[PDB]
Coordinates of C-alpha atoms in Angstrom, one line a residue:
Chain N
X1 CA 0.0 0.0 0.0
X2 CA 1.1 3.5 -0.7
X3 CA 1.7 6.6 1.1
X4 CA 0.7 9.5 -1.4
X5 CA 1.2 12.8 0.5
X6 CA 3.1 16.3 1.2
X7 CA 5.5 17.7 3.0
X8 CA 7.1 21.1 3.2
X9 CA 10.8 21.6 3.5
X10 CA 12.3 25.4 5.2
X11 CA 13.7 26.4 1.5
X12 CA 9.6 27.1 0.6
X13 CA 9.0 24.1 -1.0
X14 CA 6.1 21.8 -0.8
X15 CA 7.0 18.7 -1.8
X16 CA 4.4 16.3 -3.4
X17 CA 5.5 12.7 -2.3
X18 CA 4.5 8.9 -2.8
X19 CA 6.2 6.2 -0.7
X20 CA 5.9 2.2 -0.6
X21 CA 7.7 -0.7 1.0
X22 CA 9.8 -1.6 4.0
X23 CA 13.7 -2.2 3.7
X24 CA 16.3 -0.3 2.7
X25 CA 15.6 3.6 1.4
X26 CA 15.4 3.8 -2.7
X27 CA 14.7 7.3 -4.1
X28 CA 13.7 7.8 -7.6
X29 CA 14.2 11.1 -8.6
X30 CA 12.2 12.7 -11.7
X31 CA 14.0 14.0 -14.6
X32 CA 13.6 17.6 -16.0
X33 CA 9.8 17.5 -16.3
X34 CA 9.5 17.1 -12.8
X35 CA 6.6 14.1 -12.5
X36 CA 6.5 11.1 -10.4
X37 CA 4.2 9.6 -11.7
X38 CA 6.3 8.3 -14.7
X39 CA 7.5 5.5 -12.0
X40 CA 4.4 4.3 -10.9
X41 CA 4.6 0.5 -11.8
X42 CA 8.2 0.5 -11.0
X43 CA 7.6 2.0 -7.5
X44 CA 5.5 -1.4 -6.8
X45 CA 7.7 -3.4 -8.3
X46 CA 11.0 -1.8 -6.6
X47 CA 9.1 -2.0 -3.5
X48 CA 8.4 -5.6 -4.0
X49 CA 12.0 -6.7 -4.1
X50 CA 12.3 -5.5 0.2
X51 CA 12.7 -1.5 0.0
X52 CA 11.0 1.9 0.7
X53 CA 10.8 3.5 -2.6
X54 CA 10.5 7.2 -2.3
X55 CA 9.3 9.5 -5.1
X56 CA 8.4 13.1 -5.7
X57 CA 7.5 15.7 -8.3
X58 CA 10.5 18.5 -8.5
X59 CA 10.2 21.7 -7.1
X60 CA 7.9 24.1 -9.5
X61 CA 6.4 20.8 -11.4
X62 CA 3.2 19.1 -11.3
X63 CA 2.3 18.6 -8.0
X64 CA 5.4 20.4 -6.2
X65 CA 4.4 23.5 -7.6
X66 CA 4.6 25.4 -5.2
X67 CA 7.5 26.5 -4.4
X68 CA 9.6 29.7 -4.5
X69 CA 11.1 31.2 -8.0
X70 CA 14.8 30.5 -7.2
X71 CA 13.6 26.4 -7.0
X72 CA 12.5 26.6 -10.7
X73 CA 14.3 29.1 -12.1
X74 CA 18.2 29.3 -13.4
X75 CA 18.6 25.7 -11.7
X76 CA 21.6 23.5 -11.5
X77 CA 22.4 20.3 -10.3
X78 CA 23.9 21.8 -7.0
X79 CA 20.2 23.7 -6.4
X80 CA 18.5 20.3 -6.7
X81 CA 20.9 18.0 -5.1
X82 CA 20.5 20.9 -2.1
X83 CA 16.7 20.6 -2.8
X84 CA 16.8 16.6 -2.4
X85 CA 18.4 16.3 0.7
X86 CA 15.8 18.5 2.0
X87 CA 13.0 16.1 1.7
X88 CA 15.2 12.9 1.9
X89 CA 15.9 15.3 5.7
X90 CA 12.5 15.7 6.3
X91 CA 10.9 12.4 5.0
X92 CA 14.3 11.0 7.6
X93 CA 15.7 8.9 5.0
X94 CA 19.0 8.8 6.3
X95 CA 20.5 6.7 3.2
X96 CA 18.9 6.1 0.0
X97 CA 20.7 4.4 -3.3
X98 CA 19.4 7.2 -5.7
X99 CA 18.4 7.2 -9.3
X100 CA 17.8 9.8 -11.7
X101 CA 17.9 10.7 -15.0
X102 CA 18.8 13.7 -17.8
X103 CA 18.8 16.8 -15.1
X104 CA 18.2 13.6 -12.4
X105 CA 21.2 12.4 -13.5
X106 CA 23.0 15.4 -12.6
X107 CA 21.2 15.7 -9.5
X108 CA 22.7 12.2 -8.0
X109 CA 26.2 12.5 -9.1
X110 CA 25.7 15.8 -7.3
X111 CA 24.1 13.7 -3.9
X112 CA 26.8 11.3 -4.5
X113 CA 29.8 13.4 -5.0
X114 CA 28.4 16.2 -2.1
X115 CA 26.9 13.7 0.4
X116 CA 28.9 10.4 0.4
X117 CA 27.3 9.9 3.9
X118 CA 23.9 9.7 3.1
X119 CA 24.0 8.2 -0.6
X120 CA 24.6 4.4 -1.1
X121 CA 25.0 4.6 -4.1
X122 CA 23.6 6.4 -7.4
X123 CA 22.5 6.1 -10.8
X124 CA 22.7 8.5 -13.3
X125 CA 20.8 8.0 -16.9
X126 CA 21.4 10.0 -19.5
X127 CA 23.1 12.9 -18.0
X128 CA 23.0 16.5 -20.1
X129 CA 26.9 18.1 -20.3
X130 CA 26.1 20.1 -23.6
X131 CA 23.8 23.1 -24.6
X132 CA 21.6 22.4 -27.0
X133 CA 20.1 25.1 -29.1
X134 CA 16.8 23.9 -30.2
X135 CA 15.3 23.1 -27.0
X136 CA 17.3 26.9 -25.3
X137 CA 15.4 28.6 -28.4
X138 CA 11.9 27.4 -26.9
X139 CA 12.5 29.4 -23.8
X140 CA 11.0 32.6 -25.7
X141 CA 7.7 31.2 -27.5
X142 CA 4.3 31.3 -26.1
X143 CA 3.9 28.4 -23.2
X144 CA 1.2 27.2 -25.5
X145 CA 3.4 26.8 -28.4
X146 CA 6.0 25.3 -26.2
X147 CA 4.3 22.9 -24.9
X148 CA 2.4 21.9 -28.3
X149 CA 6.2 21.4 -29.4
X150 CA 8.2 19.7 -25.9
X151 CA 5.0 17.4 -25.6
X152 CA 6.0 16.5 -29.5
X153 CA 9.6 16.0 -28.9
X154 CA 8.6 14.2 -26.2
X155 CA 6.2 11.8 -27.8
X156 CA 8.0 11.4 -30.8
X157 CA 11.6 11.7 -30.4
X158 CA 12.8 11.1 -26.9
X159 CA 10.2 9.1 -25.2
X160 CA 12.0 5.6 -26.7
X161 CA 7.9 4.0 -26.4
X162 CA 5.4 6.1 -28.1
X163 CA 2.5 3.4 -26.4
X164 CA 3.3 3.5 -23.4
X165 CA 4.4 7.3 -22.9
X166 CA 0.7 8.1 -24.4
X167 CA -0.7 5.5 -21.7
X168 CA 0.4 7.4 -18.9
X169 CA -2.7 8.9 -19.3
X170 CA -4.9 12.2 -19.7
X171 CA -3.8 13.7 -15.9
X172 CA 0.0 12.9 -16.6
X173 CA -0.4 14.9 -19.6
X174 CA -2.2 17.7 -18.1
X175 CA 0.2 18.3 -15.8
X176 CA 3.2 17.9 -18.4
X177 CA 1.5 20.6 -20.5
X178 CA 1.9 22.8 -17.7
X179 CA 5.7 21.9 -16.9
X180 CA 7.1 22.3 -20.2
X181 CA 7.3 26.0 -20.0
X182 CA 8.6 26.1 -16.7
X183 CA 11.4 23.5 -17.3
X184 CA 12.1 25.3 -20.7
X185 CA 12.6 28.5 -18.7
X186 CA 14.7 26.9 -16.2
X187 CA 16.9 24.0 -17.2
X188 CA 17.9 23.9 -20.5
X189 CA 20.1 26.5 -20.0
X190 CA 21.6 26.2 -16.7
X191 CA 21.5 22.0 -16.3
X192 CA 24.3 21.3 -18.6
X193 CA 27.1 24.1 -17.6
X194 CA 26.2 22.6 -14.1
X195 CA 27.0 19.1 -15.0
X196 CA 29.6 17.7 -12.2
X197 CA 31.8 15.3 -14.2
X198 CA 34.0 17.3 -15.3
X199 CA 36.8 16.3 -12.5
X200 CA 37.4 13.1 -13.5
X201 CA 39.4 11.8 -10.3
X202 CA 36.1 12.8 -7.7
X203 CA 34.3 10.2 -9.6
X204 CA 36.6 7.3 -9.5
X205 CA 36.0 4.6 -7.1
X206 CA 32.7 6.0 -5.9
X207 CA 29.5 3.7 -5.9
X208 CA 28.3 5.3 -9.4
X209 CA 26.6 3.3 -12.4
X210 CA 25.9 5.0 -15.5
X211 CA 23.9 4.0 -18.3
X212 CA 22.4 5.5 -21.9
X213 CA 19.4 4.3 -23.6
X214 CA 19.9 1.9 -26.4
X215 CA 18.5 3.5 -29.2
X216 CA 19.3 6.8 -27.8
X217 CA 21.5 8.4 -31.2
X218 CA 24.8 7.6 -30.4
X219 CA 25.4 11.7 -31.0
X220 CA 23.2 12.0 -27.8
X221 CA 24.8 10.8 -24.7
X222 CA 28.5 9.9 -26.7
X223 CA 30.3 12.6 -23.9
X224 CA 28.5 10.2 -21.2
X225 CA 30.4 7.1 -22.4
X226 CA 33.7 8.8 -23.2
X227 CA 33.8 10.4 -19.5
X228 CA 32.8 7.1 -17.6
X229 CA 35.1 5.2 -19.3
X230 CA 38.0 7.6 -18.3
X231 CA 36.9 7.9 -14.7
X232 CA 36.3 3.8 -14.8
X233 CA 32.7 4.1 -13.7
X234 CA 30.3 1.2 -15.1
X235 CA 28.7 2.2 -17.6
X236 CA 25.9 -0.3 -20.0
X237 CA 22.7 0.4 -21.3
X238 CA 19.0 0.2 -21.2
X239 CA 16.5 -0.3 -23.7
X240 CA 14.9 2.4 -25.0
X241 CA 16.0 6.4 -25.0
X242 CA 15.3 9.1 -22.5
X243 CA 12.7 7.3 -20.3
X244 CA 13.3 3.8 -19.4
X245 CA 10.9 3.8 -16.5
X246 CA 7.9 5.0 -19.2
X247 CA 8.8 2.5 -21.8
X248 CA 10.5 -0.5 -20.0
X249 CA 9.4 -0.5 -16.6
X250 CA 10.1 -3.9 -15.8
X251 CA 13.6 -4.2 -17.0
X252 CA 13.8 -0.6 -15.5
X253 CA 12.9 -2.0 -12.4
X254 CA 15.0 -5.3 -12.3
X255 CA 18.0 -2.7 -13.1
X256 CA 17.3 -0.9 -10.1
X257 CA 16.7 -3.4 -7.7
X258 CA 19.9 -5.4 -9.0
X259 CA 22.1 -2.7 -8.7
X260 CA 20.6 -1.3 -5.3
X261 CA 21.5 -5.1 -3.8
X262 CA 25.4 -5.0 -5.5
X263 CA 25.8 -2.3 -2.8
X264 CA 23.8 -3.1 -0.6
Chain J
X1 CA 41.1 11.6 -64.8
X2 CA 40.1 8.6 -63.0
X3 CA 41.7 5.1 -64.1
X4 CA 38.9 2.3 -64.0
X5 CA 40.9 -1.1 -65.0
X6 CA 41.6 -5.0 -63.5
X7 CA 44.7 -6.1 -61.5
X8 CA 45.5 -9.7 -61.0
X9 CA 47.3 -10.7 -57.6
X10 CA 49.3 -14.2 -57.1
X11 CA 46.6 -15.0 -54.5
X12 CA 43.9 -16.0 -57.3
X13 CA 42.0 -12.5 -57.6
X14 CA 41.1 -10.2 -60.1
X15 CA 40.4 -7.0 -58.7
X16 CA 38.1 -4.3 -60.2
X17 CA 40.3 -1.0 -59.1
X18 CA 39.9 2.9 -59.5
X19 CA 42.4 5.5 -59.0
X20 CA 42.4 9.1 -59.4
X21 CA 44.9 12.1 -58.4
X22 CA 48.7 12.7 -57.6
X23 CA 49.9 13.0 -54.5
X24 CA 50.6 10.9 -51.4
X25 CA 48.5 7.7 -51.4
X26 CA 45.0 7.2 -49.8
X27 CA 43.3 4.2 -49.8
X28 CA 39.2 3.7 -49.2
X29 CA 38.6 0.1 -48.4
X30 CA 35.2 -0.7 -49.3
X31 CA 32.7 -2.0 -46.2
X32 CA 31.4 -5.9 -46.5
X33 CA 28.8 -5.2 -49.3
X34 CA 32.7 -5.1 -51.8
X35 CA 30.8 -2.0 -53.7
X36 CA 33.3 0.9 -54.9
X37 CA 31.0 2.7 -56.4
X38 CA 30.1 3.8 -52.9
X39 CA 33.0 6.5 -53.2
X40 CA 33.2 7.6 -56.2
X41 CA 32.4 11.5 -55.5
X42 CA 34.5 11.4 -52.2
X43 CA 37.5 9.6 -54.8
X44 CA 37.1 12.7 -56.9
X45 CA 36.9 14.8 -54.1
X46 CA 39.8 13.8 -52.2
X47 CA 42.2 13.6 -55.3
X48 CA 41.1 17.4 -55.7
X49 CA 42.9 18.3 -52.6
X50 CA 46.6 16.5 -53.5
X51 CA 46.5 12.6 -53.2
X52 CA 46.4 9.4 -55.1
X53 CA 42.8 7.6 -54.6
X54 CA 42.9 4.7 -55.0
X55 CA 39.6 2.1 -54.1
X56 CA 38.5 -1.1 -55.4
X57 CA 35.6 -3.7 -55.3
X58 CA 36.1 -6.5 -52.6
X59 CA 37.0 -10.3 -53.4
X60 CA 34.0 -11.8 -54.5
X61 CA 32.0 -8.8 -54.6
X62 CA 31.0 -6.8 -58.1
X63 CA 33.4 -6.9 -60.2
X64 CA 36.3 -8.1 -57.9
X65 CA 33.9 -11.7 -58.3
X66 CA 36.8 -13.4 -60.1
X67 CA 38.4 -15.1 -56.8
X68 CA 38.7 -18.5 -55.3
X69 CA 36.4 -19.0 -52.7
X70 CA 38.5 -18.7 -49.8
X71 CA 38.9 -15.4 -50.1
X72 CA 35.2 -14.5 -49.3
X73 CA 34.4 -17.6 -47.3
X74 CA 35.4 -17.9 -43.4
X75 CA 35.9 -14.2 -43.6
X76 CA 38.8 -12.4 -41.4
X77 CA 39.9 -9.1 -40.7
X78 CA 43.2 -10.8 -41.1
X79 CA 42.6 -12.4 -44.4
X80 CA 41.1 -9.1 -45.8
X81 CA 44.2 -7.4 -44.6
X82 CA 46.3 -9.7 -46.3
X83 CA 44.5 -9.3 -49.6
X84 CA 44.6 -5.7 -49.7
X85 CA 48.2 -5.7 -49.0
X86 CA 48.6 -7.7 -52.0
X87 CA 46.4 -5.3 -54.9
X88 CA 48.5 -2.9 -53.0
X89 CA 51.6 -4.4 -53.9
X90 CA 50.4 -4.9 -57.5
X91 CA 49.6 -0.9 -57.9
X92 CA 53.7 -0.1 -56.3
X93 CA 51.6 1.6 -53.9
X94 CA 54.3 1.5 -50.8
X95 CA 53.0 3.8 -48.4
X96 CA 49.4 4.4 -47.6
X97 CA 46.6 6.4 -45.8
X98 CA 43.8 3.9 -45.3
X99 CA 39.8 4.3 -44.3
X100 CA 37.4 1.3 -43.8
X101 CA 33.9 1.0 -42.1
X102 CA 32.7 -2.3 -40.7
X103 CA 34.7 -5.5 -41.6
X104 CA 36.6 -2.3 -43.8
X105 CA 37.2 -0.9 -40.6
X106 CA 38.7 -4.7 -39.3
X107 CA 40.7 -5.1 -42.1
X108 CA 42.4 -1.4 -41.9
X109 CA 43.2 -1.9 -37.6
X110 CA 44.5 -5.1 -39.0
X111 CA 46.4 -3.5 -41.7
X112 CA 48.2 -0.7 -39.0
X113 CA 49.2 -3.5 -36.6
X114 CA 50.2 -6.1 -38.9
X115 CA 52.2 -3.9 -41.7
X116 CA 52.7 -0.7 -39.5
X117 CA 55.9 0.6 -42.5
X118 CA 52.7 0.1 -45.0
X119 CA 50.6 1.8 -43.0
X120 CA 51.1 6.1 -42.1
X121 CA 47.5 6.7 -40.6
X122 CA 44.5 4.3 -40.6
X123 CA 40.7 5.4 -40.1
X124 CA 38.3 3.3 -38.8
X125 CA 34.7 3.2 -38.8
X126 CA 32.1 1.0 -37.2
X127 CA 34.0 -1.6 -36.5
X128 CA 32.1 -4.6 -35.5
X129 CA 33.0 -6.8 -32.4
X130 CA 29.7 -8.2 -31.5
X131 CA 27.8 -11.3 -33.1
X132 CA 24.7 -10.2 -34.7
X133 CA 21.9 -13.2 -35.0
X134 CA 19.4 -11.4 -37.3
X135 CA 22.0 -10.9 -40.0
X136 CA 24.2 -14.2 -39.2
X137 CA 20.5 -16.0 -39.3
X138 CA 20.4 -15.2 -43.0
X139 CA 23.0 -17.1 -44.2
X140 CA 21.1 -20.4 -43.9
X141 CA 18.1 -18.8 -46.5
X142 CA 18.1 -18.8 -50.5
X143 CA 19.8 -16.7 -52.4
X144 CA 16.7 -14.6 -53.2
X145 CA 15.3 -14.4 -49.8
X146 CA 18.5 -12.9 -48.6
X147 CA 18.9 -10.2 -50.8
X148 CA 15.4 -9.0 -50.2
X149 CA 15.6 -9.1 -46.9
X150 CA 19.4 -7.4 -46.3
X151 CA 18.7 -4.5 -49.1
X152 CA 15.5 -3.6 -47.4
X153 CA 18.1 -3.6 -43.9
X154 CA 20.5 -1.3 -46.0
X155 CA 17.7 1.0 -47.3
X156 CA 15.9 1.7 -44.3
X157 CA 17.7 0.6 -41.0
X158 CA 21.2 1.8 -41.6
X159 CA 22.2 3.7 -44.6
X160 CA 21.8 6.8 -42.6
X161 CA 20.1 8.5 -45.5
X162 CA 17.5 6.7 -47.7
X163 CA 17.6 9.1 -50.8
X164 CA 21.4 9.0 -51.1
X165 CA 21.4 5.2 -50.8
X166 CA 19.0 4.6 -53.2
X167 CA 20.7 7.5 -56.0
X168 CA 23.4 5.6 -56.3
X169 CA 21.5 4.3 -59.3
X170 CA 19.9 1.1 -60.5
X171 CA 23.3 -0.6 -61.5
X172 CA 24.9 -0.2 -58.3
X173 CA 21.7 -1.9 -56.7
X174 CA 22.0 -4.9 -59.4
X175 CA 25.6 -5.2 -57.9
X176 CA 24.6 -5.6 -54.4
X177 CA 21.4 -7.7 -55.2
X178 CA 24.2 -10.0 -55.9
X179 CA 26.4 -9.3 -53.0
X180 CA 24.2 -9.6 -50.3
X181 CA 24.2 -13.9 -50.5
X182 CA 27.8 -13.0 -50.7
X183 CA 28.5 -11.1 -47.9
X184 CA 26.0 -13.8 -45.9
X185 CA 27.8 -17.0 -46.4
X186 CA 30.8 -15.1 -45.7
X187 CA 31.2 -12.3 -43.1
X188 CA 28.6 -12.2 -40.2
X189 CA 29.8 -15.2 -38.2
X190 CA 34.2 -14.9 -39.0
X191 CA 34.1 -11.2 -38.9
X192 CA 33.3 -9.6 -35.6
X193 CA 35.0 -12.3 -33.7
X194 CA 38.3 -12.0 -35.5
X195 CA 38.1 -7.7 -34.6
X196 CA 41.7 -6.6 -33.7
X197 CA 40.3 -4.4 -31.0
X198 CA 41.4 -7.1 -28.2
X199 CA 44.6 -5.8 -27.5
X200 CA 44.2 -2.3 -26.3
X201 CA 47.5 -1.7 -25.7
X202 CA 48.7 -2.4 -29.5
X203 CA 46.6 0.4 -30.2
X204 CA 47.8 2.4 -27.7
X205 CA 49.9 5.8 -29.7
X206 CA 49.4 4.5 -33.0
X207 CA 48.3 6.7 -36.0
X208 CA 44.4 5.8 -35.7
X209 CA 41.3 7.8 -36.0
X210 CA 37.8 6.0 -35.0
X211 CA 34.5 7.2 -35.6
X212 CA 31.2 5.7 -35.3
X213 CA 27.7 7.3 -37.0
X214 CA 26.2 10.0 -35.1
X215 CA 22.9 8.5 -36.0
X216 CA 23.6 4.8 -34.8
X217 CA 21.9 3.8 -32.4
X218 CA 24.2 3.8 -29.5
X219 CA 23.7 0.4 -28.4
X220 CA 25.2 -0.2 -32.2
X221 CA 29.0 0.4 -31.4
X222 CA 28.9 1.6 -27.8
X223 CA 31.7 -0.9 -28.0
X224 CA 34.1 0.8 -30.3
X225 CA 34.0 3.8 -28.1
X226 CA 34.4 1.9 -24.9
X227 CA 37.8 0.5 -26.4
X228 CA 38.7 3.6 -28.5
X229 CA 38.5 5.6 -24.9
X230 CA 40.7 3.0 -22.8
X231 CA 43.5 2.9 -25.4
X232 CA 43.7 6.4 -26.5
X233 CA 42.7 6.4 -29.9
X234 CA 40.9 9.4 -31.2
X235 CA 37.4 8.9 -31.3
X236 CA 34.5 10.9 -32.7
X237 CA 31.5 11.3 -35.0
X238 CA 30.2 12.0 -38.6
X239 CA 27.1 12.6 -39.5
X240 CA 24.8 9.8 -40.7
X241 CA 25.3 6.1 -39.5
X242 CA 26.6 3.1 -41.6
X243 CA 28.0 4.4 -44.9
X244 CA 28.6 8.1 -43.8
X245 CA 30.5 8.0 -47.9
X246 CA 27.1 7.5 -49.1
X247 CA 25.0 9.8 -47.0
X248 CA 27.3 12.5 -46.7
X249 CA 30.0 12.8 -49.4
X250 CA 31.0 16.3 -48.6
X251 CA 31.7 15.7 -44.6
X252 CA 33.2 12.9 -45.5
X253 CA 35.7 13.6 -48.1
X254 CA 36.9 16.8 -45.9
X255 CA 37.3 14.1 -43.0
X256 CA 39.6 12.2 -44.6
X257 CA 41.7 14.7 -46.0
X258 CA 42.1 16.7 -42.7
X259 CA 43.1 13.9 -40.8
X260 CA 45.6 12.8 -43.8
X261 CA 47.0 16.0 -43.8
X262 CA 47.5 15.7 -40.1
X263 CA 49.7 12.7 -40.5
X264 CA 52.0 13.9 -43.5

């Protein structure tokens, strides 16, 4: 059974939260768009295996939204990794293996690298080190016409499961449609400069297990493999692209769990 | 003005060949289809900027067909080196710039660590290391069945450019109906297996310049950057995926004469 509540943290926020399952603390933490409820079956199944899965929306998304302007606005990995341990604080979830991917990604090598005491160890998918143009250049349209296009590049180019991202569902969607123009405001720009990887010798020998999706374009992610490799992090893949949890959830799952008991 | 004749080796072929230019030699190896034709505005292209081109169909393949059967049976990066060192040797070509994608991109690693005074610079592409059961599968089929099958792979899965790939013209397409039952019998199981990637550390400071297809899926040759990035070598993109010769002639040609000139 599953807690589904709130809870407000002294930096303004009010997280929205879900929680299921006794045993050790896994927290999986949203990408850019900010919504939990792309884990759903995975939290079950996660939970399943023996552990407390822990999810939110991000600060300024979907059902997190409200929060003050600095949460959402010109953020960084180091704003959300400080935004994190707030709730992880507050929900007392002293350690947690943590996932996360695109700006989650950052987020958890930032926990990892910033907290070693409190993560067990992370996993970053997909994680952003470049500015890219198209999606910066969205930042000035209407929100409309933003989301009409982010919930398209979503659908059809990133979302690695057109099926199952659409059967999210109608709410999922509403609330998306609302998030696009606040991410586009607030991340593209500021996520990637942010991107803690570039010193190679803080991530060597830490508890770390990147991956890329499969059919991602190998243009995508390549600076991801190149930099693990160097720092002799794992590295493998998943099926799919930006979203395994959408379009793979139970091998999404089963990667989670297996990993979370290597360290365990 | 380009040369289009025949060359006969002591190793049973007869080699259709093209040349065209003055200057320091490069050499474009075809990829396992054996098909020349693939090059023939990067030929021109690259000659235009002061070098010898010098390209040729494969043993077996269009009209390098005239060979004994071990030369395109039990293929090997190995074997393929061997052979091109040999139409080499029959065109007084002594020192050489080389480029190859797939088992091309075998044969040319194979050709820098076996024959490294032949050899000034070598660039690879795509080089495969992994079994692949859909393609290896085909080999058992009739002759027919396979060519249907494999073109429809090369039009639409990874030519990296449908339009290009299909001007190459009617003829071309005749050729490779043919080559495809070839290339089957011949190359799927021997190649990857015999990849000269095991030995990082041979490849470790030599004169070698990877790239794999921006558009490739990454799960494709994840591989091949992996090894490129814990021995050193240069790795990178161009644009397109499989046959970036094809799909982008112009990137392409400029590619190979930068990184030629880098090594004179």
């Amino acid at each position: 059974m599953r807690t589904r509540s709130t809870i407000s943290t002294p930096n303004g926020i009010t997280w929205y939260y879900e929680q299921e399952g006794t045993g050790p603390d896994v927290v999986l933490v949203p990408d850019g768009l900010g919504e939990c409820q792309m884990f759903d079956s995975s939290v079950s199944q996660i939970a399943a295996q023996g552990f407390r899965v822990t999810t939110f929306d991000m600060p300024g998304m979907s059902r997190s939204a409200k929060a003050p302007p600095e949460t959402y606005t010109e953020v960084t990995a180091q704003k959300l990794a400080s935004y994190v341990i707030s709730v992880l604080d507050a929900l007392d979830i002293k350690h947690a293996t943590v996932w996360g991917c695109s700006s989650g990604a950052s987020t958890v090598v930032a926990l990892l690298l910033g907290y070693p005491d409190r993560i067990r160890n992370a996993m970053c998918h997909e994680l952003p080190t470049k500015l890219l143009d198209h999606l910066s250049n969205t930042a000035v349209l209407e929100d409309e016409e933003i989301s009409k296009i982010l919930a398209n590049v979503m659908l059809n180019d990133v979302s690695g499961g057109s099926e199952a991202w659409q059967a999210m569902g109608d709410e999922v969607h509403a609330r998306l449609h609302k998030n696009y123009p606040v991410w586009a405001r607030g991340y593209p720009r500021t996520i990637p400069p942010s991107a803690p990887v570039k010193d190679l010798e803080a991530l060597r020998g830490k508890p770390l297990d990147w991956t890329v999706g499969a059919a991602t374009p190998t243009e995508s992610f390549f600076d991801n493999i190149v930099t693990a490799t160097k720092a002799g992090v794992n590295i493998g893949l998943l099926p799919g692209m930006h979203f395994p949890y959408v379009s793979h959830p139970d091998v999404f799952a089963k990667y989670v769990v297996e990993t979370t008991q290597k360290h365990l």
